[PDB]
Protein backbone atom coordinates (compact mmCIF):
# COMPACT_ATOMS: atom_id res chain seq x y z
CA UNK A 1 0.00 0.00 0.00
CA UNK A 2 2.20 2.82 1.39
CA UNK A 3 5.84 2.90 2.55
CA UNK A 4 7.42 4.68 5.55
CA UNK A 5 10.59 5.74 3.61
CA UNK A 6 10.77 8.20 0.67
CA UNK A 7 12.93 10.90 2.32
CA UNK A 8 16.41 12.22 1.63
CA UNK A 9 18.25 15.50 2.18
CA UNK A 10 19.75 17.76 -0.49
CA UNK A 11 23.28 16.72 -1.52
CA UNK A 12 25.78 19.08 0.10
CA UNK A 13 28.42 19.28 -2.70
CA UNK A 14 31.21 18.38 -0.27
CA UNK A 15 34.65 17.16 -1.33
CA UNK A 16 37.84 18.54 -2.83
CA UNK A 17 37.42 21.77 -4.83
CA UNK A 18 41.14 22.33 -5.56
CA UNK A 19 43.36 19.27 -6.10
CA UNK A 20 47.14 18.95 -5.62
CA UNK A 21 49.31 21.42 -7.55
CA UNK A 22 46.38 23.79 -8.33
CA UNK A 23 47.18 27.51 -8.03
CA UNK A 24 44.66 29.21 -5.71
CA UNK A 25 44.06 32.79 -4.53
CA UNK A 26 43.91 33.47 -0.78
CA UNK A 27 40.40 32.70 0.52
CA UNK A 28 39.84 29.90 -2.03
CA UNK A 29 38.06 26.85 -0.59
CA UNK A 30 40.20 23.73 -1.03
CA UNK A 31 37.89 21.14 0.58
CA UNK A 32 34.40 21.06 2.07
CA UNK A 33 33.99 18.26 4.57
CA UNK A 34 32.26 17.01 7.70
CA UNK A 35 34.84 17.17 10.48
CA UNK A 36 38.56 17.10 9.67
CA UNK A 37 38.98 14.28 7.16
CA UNK A 38 41.71 16.64 5.94
CA UNK A 39 43.56 18.87 8.42
CA UNK A 40 44.80 22.43 7.89
CA UNK A 41 48.53 22.58 7.10
CA UNK A 42 50.68 25.65 6.35
CA UNK A 43 48.80 28.69 4.93
CA UNK A 44 45.45 26.85 5.26
CA UNK A 45 42.67 27.86 7.65
CA UNK A 46 39.90 25.62 9.00
CA UNK A 47 36.43 27.23 8.94
CA UNK A 48 33.59 26.62 11.41
CA UNK A 49 32.12 23.86 9.17
CA UNK A 50 35.64 22.34 8.80
CA UNK A 51 36.05 23.97 5.35
CA UNK A 52 39.75 24.23 4.52
CA UNK A 53 40.62 27.44 2.69
CA UNK A 54 43.80 29.12 1.45
CA UNK A 55 45.22 31.89 3.68
CA UNK A 56 47.84 32.71 0.99
CA UNK A 57 48.16 32.63 -2.79
CA UNK A 58 50.05 29.49 -3.85
CA UNK A 59 49.72 25.83 -4.86
CA UNK A 60 47.68 23.19 -3.03
CA UNK A 61 49.79 20.43 -1.46
CA UNK A 62 48.30 17.29 0.11
CA UNK A 63 50.59 15.54 2.61
CA UNK A 64 50.34 12.66 5.08
CA UNK A 65 52.07 13.75 8.29
CA UNK A 66 52.50 13.16 12.03
CA UNK A 67 52.10 10.07 14.31
CA UNK A 68 48.48 9.34 13.25
CA UNK A 69 49.25 9.54 9.47
CA UNK A 70 46.60 12.24 9.02
CA UNK A 71 46.04 14.01 5.71
CA UNK A 72 47.06 17.69 5.78
CA UNK A 73 46.44 20.28 3.09
CA UNK A 74 48.97 23.11 2.74
CA UNK A 75 49.51 26.01 0.36
CA UNK A 76 53.06 26.28 -1.03
CA UNK A 77 53.28 30.08 -1.39
CA UNK B 1 9.21 26.86 20.90
CA UNK B 2 9.41 27.38 24.67
CA UNK B 3 12.05 30.12 24.22
CA UNK B 4 10.52 33.60 23.76
CA UNK B 5 12.09 36.56 21.95
CA UNK B 6 13.33 39.48 24.07
CA UNK B 7 15.24 42.66 23.30
CA UNK B 8 18.40 43.67 25.13
CA UNK B 9 18.12 47.48 25.38
CA UNK B 10 21.18 49.75 25.69
CA UNK B 11 21.68 51.52 29.04
CA UNK B 12 23.25 54.46 27.12
CA UNK B 13 19.81 55.81 26.03
CA UNK B 14 20.57 55.51 22.29
CA UNK B 15 17.46 53.39 21.62
CA UNK B 16 19.80 50.67 20.25
CA UNK B 17 18.80 47.09 21.05
CA UNK B 18 19.96 43.57 20.36
CA UNK B 19 17.43 40.74 20.11
CA UNK B 20 17.81 37.19 21.42
CA UNK B 21 15.71 34.36 22.83
CA UNK B 22 15.20 33.29 26.45
CA UNK B 23 13.69 30.34 28.30
CA UNK B 24 11.49 32.46 30.57
CA UNK B 25 10.51 29.54 32.86
CA UNK B 26 13.96 28.16 33.77
CA UNK B 27 15.48 31.69 33.79
CA UNK B 28 13.06 34.45 35.02
CA UNK B 29 15.91 36.81 36.09
CA UNK B 30 16.55 39.59 33.56
CA UNK B 31 19.39 38.94 31.10
CA UNK B 32 22.06 41.65 31.47
CA UNK B 33 25.19 41.66 29.27
CA UNK B 34 27.85 44.20 28.31
CA UNK B 35 27.37 44.63 24.54
CA UNK B 36 28.74 47.04 21.94
CA UNK B 37 26.44 50.03 21.41
CA UNK B 38 27.32 51.25 17.85
CA UNK B 39 25.64 54.65 18.39
CA UNK B 40 27.92 55.68 21.32
CA UNK B 41 30.60 53.22 20.00
CA UNK B 42 31.27 51.74 23.47
CA UNK B 43 30.61 48.51 25.36
CA UNK B 44 27.78 49.30 27.81
CA UNK B 45 25.37 47.27 29.95
CA UNK B 46 22.38 46.00 27.96
CA UNK B 47 19.29 44.87 29.88
CA UNK B 48 16.35 42.64 28.93
CA UNK B 49 13.05 44.16 27.78
CA UNK B 50 9.94 42.86 25.99
CA UNK B 51 10.19 42.31 22.21
Amino acid sequence: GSTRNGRDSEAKRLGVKRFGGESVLAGSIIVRQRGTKFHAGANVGCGRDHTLFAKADGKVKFEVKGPKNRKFISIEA
Amino acid sequence: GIREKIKLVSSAGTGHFYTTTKNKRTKPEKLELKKFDPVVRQHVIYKEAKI
Binding site: - | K5, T19, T20, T21, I51
Partner: protein
Protein backbone atom coordinates in the same frame (compact mmCIF):
# COMPACT_ATOMS: atom_id res chain seq x y z
CA UNK C 1 -1.09 52.18 -27.46
CA UNK C 2 1.84 52.83 -25.13
CA UNK C 3 3.23 49.80 -23.29
CA UNK C 4 2.25 49.85 -19.61
CA UNK C 5 4.99 49.53 -17.00
CA UNK C 6 4.46 46.68 -14.55
CA UNK C 7 4.18 49.04 -11.61
CA UNK C 8 5.22 46.43 -9.03
CA UNK C 9 8.52 45.96 -10.91
CA UNK C 10 9.08 49.75 -11.01
CA UNK C 11 8.88 49.75 -7.18
CA UNK C 12 11.53 46.94 -6.96
CA UNK C 13 14.17 47.76 -9.60
CA UNK C 14 16.19 50.87 -10.45
CA UNK C 15 18.24 51.02 -13.68
CA UNK C 16 22.02 51.58 -13.23
CA UNK C 17 24.56 53.45 -15.42
CA UNK C 18 25.41 50.53 -17.77
CA UNK C 19 21.74 49.45 -18.05
CA UNK C 20 21.74 46.85 -15.26
CA UNK C 21 19.11 46.92 -12.51
CA UNK C 22 19.71 47.28 -8.77
CA UNK C 23 17.29 45.65 -6.34
CA UNK C 24 16.95 45.25 -2.59
CA UNK C 25 17.75 41.80 -1.19
CA UNK C 26 15.04 39.42 0.00
CA UNK C 27 14.98 38.02 3.58
CA UNK C 28 15.36 41.32 5.55
CA UNK C 29 11.70 42.17 6.31
CA UNK C 30 11.06 40.05 9.41
CA UNK C 31 12.04 36.91 11.35
CA UNK C 32 15.31 38.77 12.00
CA UNK C 33 16.30 37.63 15.53
CA UNK C 34 17.22 34.09 14.36
CA UNK C 35 19.31 35.45 11.45
CA UNK C 36 23.03 36.04 12.02
CA UNK C 37 24.21 39.67 11.98
CA UNK C 38 26.67 38.71 9.20
CA UNK C 39 23.84 37.33 7.06
CA UNK C 40 21.68 40.43 7.61
CA UNK C 41 24.63 42.79 7.05
CA UNK C 42 25.29 41.20 3.63
CA UNK C 43 21.58 41.58 2.73
CA UNK C 44 21.55 45.36 3.44
CA UNK C 45 23.35 46.73 0.29
CA UNK C 46 21.48 46.72 -3.03
CA UNK C 47 22.45 43.99 -5.51
CA UNK C 48 22.36 43.70 -9.29
CA UNK C 49 19.80 41.57 -11.13
CA UNK C 50 21.45 38.38 -12.46
CA UNK C 51 21.79 37.56 -16.19
CA UNK C 52 19.06 34.87 -16.06
CA UNK C 53 16.54 37.44 -14.76
CA UNK C 54 17.37 40.59 -16.80
CA UNK C 55 15.04 39.47 -19.62
CA UNK C 56 12.14 39.24 -17.15
CA UNK C 57 12.94 42.65 -15.58
CA UNK C 58 13.43 44.40 -18.95
CA UNK C 59 10.06 43.06 -20.18
CA UNK C 60 8.38 44.49 -17.05
CA UNK C 61 10.17 47.89 -17.29
CA UNK C 62 10.12 49.11 -20.94
CA UNK C 63 10.46 52.78 -19.85
CA UNK C 64 13.23 52.21 -17.25
Amino acid sequence: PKIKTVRGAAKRFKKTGKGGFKHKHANLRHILTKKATKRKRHLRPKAMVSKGDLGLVIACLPYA
